[PDB]
């Protein structure tokens, strides 16, 4: 079942630096030319492409067609970064070829005909790129990619023209945020051409201290060079976060243990919590788990509950519009329950 | 021995009338002994003779159901031990800190504390759980007469018992109740009630009397009038105002439940969440959270936490008792870590 908001067995595996790096994501955007039926209609191209993947994937993959999913199922796929918002809503023949472990997602008929996604836990960009490239090679053996031998892969949005590659890592940087170093690392990332965004919240507030660092640097660099560059910056960010964490432990000791356990205590017991406080507390709890203060709570609580406690998702899940105070009560209840599952 | 290592005696652990709000009822009777100068004037020789008088008369003396009296001399106790007795409300800060020749006769059940060389030669204290002012006054008056069979009180027909303090003039009677008034505090009402009560000849003080703060919204309501009113009327008048206070607190709770609803449940559970999980907590925060949790158990929000454990924790988390329980002296930051751990384990054993 792909619509389990919990961290998959695949994404809960401990990849390199997976305490700080939640996940590594490789996306390869492709468009197809010279269709098997040279149709003039996008409708027909989109259906041939779906037929291709339904015929060619029955490793176990399920082809999820957006037209066949309830809106909450599509929202979960969106929140799992398995599909884009555009695939859920705006793609009449949108479909997602999902591997059973949800490592592999091939979005069909979005902006581009093909978006191959590999999502790995921890810092495994090279592994994700290799896995995405193996599917890329498989797909290209059966279709012709729109490709200009001097411009590279042709993608609908010129955001991707060239390699069609977007590489991203999601990182939890509570210590850099706590010690107010985060706005020091943003310029270093921007100078290198990478893009850093908060994953959760509205415009740059980065709830949960979860950051997405991705490339933008396109035409010049090889895919391996894009990924090596991102990997290298991520490893420096990891080192900075670990240094900040170790400084925090050495300075605060029991006061840091107290901070993360109080955040735990709020999450385990509060009856009213807004998404911002929940995010801060979840980040603290995750840090406390990472530091081994909190020993009986899965670190995946951060990944899962950051999704489930978002205001819009919470309403989407509840099936209706909820006032903020109603959201805060349901959010607290959801969080308490998920932490009660950990106590058992 | 057990005076220092049990936070709440079996005696004080009994549920009393209205004991959810009224934690305790106390009657103190101040007296001086004829032929001894009062503690503000006496010599060290007189002070020692006073202790010796009470020692000879009352050490190990049986007092019925209360067990026998034990004599604790302040000079023979350490400041932590004395702080423990203050924190258990068995002796006054004055006796613990300001009476070199102070002593206290404690009943084995810790209902009775006869302080010696406090502000007066004798401060007879009877402590009852819940709202039991009539029973405490009866107990104290009985004990007063019983003691007076062994000492003669300085007494003037006009001025009553001659005491050292203007605040004991006449009856020497201080009747007090300890009340948990979290709703009146939260509704801001307490701000109007305190001056209103002060104008009726009562006074509202903190948890450890004059000059102390209301730890955990625990207020001491006591008479201010000691002279020109019978002891029964002083206590009856206090009781009447305590009953009104209970009524106001209960109404304030119902008002809070209706106006805050889940936010009140959130308030108490967050305090519970702190207590169950914090690793560092000072006694003041602990008291505030314990107050919230007590309110939460009173309103039925919080299950599996007894008033008994909350009573124990209110005492165990005090600095002296913490150091007593620890085994020795603790700096503030050590206290806060041991306090958090004590609370966590008591709350976790409370929920198992
Ligand atoms: N915005 C809210 N709640 C509003 C409460 C006011 C303020 N945040 C407070 O809690 O004090 N919830 P959401 O689901 O995170 O949007
Ligand atoms: N006075 C204190 N603590 C002072 C603050 C120390 C701070 N929590 C810290 O960790 O240093 N505790 P007490 O036992 O209530 O007297």
Curated annotation (Swiss-Prot), chain B:
Q: Which GO terms describe its molecular function?
A: ATP binding; creatine kinase activity; protein kinase activity
What happens on changing residue 89 to A? Loss of protein kinase activity
Give the motif span (RDXXRA motif of the pArg binding pocket involved in allosteric regulation): 335-340
Task: Supply the enzyme class, top level.
Answer: transferase
Q: Which GO terms describe its biological process?
A: phosphocreatine biosynthetic process
Q: Does the keyword Transferase apply?
A: yes
Q: What is the effect of changing residue 119 to A?
A: Loss of protein kinase activity
- Record EC number: 2.7.14.1
**Which residues are recorded as binding ATP?**
24-28, 89, 123, 174-178, 205-210
Q: What is the effect of changing residue 165 to A?
A: Loss of protein kinase activity
**Reaction equations catalysed:** L-arginyl-[protein] + ATP = N(omega)-phospho-L-arginyl-[protein] + ADP + H(+)
Give the family, as the similarity comment puts it.
Belongs to the ATP:guanido phosphotransferase family.
Summarize the subunit comment: Homodimer. Dimerization is important for full catalytic activity.
Q: What is known of its domains?
A: In the 3D-structure the McsB dimer adopts a flat 'domino tile' shape, with the two active sites opening on the same side. Individual subunits are composed of the N-terminal catalytic, ATP:guanido phosphotransferase domain (PD, residues 1-263) and the C-terminal dimerization domain (DD, residues 264-355), which are linearly organized in a PD-DD-DD*-PD* manner (asterisk denotes the partner protomer). The PhK-like catalytic phosphotransferase domain is structurally adapted to target protein substrates.
Q: What does this protein do?
A: Catalyzes the specific phosphorylation of arginine residues in a large number of proteins. Is part of the bacterial stress response system, where it is involved in regulating the global heat shock repressor CtsR; phosphorylates arginine residues in the winged helix-turn-helix domain of CtsR, thereby preventing its binding to DNA and consequently inducing the expression of repressed genes.
What is this protein identified as? Protein-arginine kinase
Q: Which organism encodes this protein?
A: Geobacillus stearothermophilus (Bacillus stearothermophilus)
Q: What is the lineage of its organism?
A: Bacteria, Bacillati, Bacillota, Bacilli, Bacillales
Q: Which gene encodes it?
A: mcsB
């Amino acid at each position: 079942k792909f619509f389990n908001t919990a961290v998959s067995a695949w994404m809960s595996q401990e990849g390199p630096n997976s305490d700080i790096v939640l996940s590594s994501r490789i996306r390869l955007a492709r468009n197809i030319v010279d269709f098997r039926f040279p149709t003039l209609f996008s409708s027909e191209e989109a259906k041939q492409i779906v037929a291709l993947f339904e015929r060619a994937f029955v490793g176990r993959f399920e082809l999820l067609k957006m037209s066949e999913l309830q809106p909450i199922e599509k929202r979960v796929l969106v929140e799992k970064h398995l599909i884009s918002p555009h695939l859920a809503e705006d793609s009449p023949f949108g479909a997602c070829l999902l591997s059973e472990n949800e490592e592999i997602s091939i979005m069909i008929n979005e902006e581009d005909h093909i978006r191959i996604q590999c999502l790995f836990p921890g810092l495994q960009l090279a592994e994700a790129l290799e896995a995405a490239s193996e599917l890329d090679d498989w797909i290209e053996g059966h279709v012709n990619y729109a490709f200009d031998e001097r411009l590279g892969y042709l993608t609908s949005c010129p955001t991707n023209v060239g390699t069609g590659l977007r590489a991203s890592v999601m990182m939890h940087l509570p210590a850099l945020v706590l010690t107010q170093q985060i706005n020091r690392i943003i310029p270093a990332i921007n100078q290198l051409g990478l893009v850093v965004r908060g994953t959760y919240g509205e415009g740059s507030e980065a709830l949960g201290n979860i950051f997405q660092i991705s490339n933008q640097i396109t035409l010049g660099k090889s895919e391996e060079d894009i990924v090596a560059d991102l990997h290298t910056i991520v490893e420096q960010l990891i080192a900075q976060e670990r240094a900040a964490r170790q400084a925090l432990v050495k300075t605060l000791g029991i006061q840091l243990e107290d901070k993360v356990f109080r955040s735990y205590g709020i999450l385990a017991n509060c009856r009213v919590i807004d998404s911002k406080e929940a995010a801060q507390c979840l980040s603290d709890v995750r840090l406390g788990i990472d530091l081994g203060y909190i020993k009986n709570v899965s670190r995946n609580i951060l990944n899962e509950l950051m999704i489930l406690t978002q205001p819009g998702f919470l309403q989407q899940y509840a099936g209706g519009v909820l006032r903020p105070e109603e959201r805060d009560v349901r959010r607290a209840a959801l969080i308490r329950e998920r932490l009660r599952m950990e106590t058992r």
